[PDB]
Amino acid sequence: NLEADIVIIGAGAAGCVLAYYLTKFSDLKIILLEAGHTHFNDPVVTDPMGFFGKYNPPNENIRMSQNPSYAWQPALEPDTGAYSMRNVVAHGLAVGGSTAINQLNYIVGGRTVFDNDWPTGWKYDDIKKYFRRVLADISPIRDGTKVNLTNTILESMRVLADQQVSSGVPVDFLINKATGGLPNIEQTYQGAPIVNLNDYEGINSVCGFKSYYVGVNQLSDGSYIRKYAGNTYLNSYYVDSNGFGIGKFSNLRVISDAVVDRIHFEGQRAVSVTYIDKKGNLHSVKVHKEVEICSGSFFTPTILQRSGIGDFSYLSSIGVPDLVYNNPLVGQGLRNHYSPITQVSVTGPDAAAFLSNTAAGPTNMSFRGAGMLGYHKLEPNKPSNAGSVTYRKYELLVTGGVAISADQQYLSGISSSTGNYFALIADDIRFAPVGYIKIGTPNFPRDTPKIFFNTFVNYTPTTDPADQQWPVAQKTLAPLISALLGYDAIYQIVQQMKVVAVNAGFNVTLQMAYPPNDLLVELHNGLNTYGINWWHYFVPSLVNDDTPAGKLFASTLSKLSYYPRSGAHLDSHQSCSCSIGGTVDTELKVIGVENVRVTDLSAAPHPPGGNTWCTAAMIGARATDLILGKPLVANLPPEDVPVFT
């Protein structure tokens, strides 16, 4: 018999925090049903370079995000906006969840997004303590080596932002209003004082800096290691090697390899939970007080439908045997970030000397900065607070080498064989597309549910007058407009790059190859000759302009639109699957029953401003507080860390 009252389902980035601190300051019984094992000895997972295939045997050079021993492999339905191609994205399969197989970034999400996007009691001032706690527990590290590329970028940014402060435009992309009127770009000289983008009081929404924060820890020996949720919260110091708590944590049980099917359910008080061991046997943990769901964005709603709470007509049509509650918002409104790709060529006598120290390393991992921007001026879909508050919209990145897939490499002909390349990425942060998740089999936890996520749907003109069908075209074309404005943003930095590199004693030439520059200069001409109505030319049938200028600009837009659909990566940064206000209240509690609550990244009512690791950790901390009834994690001193072994 396996009676319990604390029942966590999944040791993700939020499961570990919740379980660790809940067991630290409470003496209930805790079972953590995890379905993965602890890769404490696997050299590929500990060494960060193993992320880049140092240990793969020659036959099978793949990344852990694809390997089925490491990650769940859902396959999404075809994307009607990207030529009906189906993507595979990964939830982790290990203690610590996705953190075991991630890229280790720590962007906390600025003041603006939570203050004006999150409900009462979750404002930036109400949770920033939790964020301090988690960034303290990890204690990530930066790189401190010089690279002339980042300096070039940041001085070009200063050049351009000085024009932007003048001319009085209130929402241009290099503007910050917490710093008076000017974002604090990091200085450019030996040992300049650093800019920390994750500042405690969220001063910097827009800024420029020079390296990122990754979850490594330099060891005394000289080798760097992965530092993740399983590594910190649940290691040999607290949990027995068989899955039992140690001393102070004695009421803490970890069933490592256990997939939960559903939560058996009585009255409206869920009473029991079923799991399947590796040896094939069902068991049942009895539930006395509560159950916890921390099983990722994708699988959490599936757990809920199989449990019994969800849309009755659909679930009955597929044939789940038990119905509990009719909540037709279960698992709705998924979101994610997106990232197109852009290349540059270099042509000069000493360009090889201009790009040294750009190889990925154990501290940088193929990152060289290099900024974070806001809305472009000519963006039409901005919130009403754009004028008085600055928003985090574009997440600039930079890397050496080639990032485009080998097919695009064949098409453009630009290969890493000819060494003149580096990539700039504008990771959209406020991406619009919204999708939903269902199940197709009421049987067991699969590896692929129904996932619909359509991105770049083009507009179909109708016979309605243009005067009331522009404001549906706008909202349909939103992602295209945002991606194109990001293209403009990257395009209009490269010339300041040319200037500052020529003037810093470097004789090289910079010209974008993918996408080809000529398209972009034509776009710039069209933009600054057509004004805010530049986006009216996505649908040439509505403008009714036969002048060759507008015809050529619309043609340019048309041929350009191929590249965000083709040359991009889909971000793993899923979120927002069981949002507050949709299926749960501000207490994370599930609406319709009394003893089930969801406490993971699915509950976020809005996607945060960065790589969505820290937000889920925060949610775990806060949910610990909510179940506890009193704030202790908020009141713990910042400099107490869990032990590291």
Asked if 92 and 85 count as a contact pair (C-beta separation under 8 A), the reply is no
Residue of 372, 429, 604, 616 interacting with ligand FAD (CB under 6 A): 616
Tokens for 327, please give them.
């909540």
CB of 221 to a copy of itself, least distance (A): 8
**91 has which bridge partners?**
72
Asked if 570 and 576 count as a contact pair (C-beta separation under 8 A), the reply is no
Q: Is 573 a catalytic residue?
A: yes
241 binds a copy of itself (CB under 8 A): no
DSSP letter string, 243-294: SBB-GGG-SEEEESS-EEEEEEEETTEEEEEEEE-TTS-EEEEEBSS-EEE-
Task: Tell whether 72 is in a known binding site.
Answer: yes
User: Whose CB is nearest to ligand FAD?
Assistant: 97
CB of 313 to a copy of itself, least distance (A): 6
CA angle 194, 197, 199 (to 5 degrees): 95
Which are the contacts of 73, defined by CB distance < 8 A and separation ≥ 6?
66, 88, 90, 447, 448
CB of 368 to ligand FAD, least distance (A): 15
CB of 388 to a copy of itself, least distance (A): 32
3-state SS assignment for residue 524: helix
Nearest to 616 by CA among 582, 575, 570, 571: 575
Catalytic residue among 39, 337, 376, 573: 573
Q: How far apart are CA 108 and CA 126, in angstroms?
A: 14
Query: Which residue number, 310 or 526, has a Cβ lying nearer to a copy of itself?
Result: 310
10 binds ligand FAD (CB under 6 A): yes
Tell me, by CB under 8 A, how many residues bind a copy of itself: 17
- Contact code string over 562-601 relative to ligand FAD, x by CB under 6 A: ----------xx--------------------------xx
Asked if 334 and 453 count as a contact pair (C-beta separation under 8 A), the reply is yes
Nearest to 333 by CA among 359, 309, 301: 301
Query: Which residue number, 176 or 611, has a Cβ lying nearer to ligand FAD?
Result: 611
Tokens for 433, please give them.
């597309």
644 binds a copy of itself (CB under 8 A): yes
Query: Which residue number, 278 or 559, has a Cβ lying nearer to ligand FAD?
Result: 278
Partner whose footprint covers residue 12, from ligand FAD, a copy of itself, none (CB < 5 to 8 Å by kind): ligand FAD
368 binds ligand FAD (CB under 6 A): no
- Contact code string over 38-67 relative to ligand FAD, x by CB under 6 A: ---------------------------x--
Partner whose footprint covers residue 501, from ligand FAD, a copy of itself, none (CB < 5 to 8 Å by kind): none
Nearest to 38 by CA among 11, 60, 15: 11
Q: How far apart are CA 278 and CA 281, in angstroms?
A: 8
Task: Tell whether 98 is in a known binding site.
Answer: yes
Task: Tell whether 295 is in a known binding site.
Answer: yes
- Strand-by-strand arrangement of the 252-255 sheet: 252-255, 30-33, 6-9, 291-293, 596-598
Residue list 146-205, contact with a copy of itself (CB under 8 A)? none
- Contact code string over 273-312 relative to a copy of itself, x by CB under 8 A: --------------------------------------xx
CB of 198 to a copy of itself, least distance (A): 25
CA angle 85, 392, 567 (to 5 degrees): 25
Residue list 570-609, contact with a copy of itself (CB under 8 A)? none
Asked if 369 and 476 count as a contact pair (C-beta separation under 8 A), the reply is no
Q: How far apart are CA 498 and CA 503, in angstroms?
A: 8
- Contact code string over 335-364 relative to a copy of itself, x by CB under 8 A: ---------------------x--------
Q: How far apart are CA 394 and CA 207, in angstroms?
A: 11
463 binds a copy of itself (CB under 8 A): yes
CB of 453 to a copy of itself, least distance (A): 16
Q: How far apart are CA 585 and CA 583, in angstroms?
A: 7
Tokens for 593, please give them.
């029953």
Asked if 30 and 6 count as a contact pair (C-beta separation under 8 A), the reply is yes
Active site residues: 573
Residues that bind a copy of itself (CB under 8 A): 219-220, 236-237, 311-314, 316, 323, 326, 328, 356, 463, 643-645
Known binding-site residue numbers for FAD: 13, 34, 72, 91-92, 94, 98, 103, 260, 295, 601, 612
Binding interface with ligand FAD (CB under 6 A): 9-14, 33-36, 65, 90-93, 97-99, 101-103, 105, 259-260, 295-296, 299, 445, 572-573, 600-601, 611-613, 616
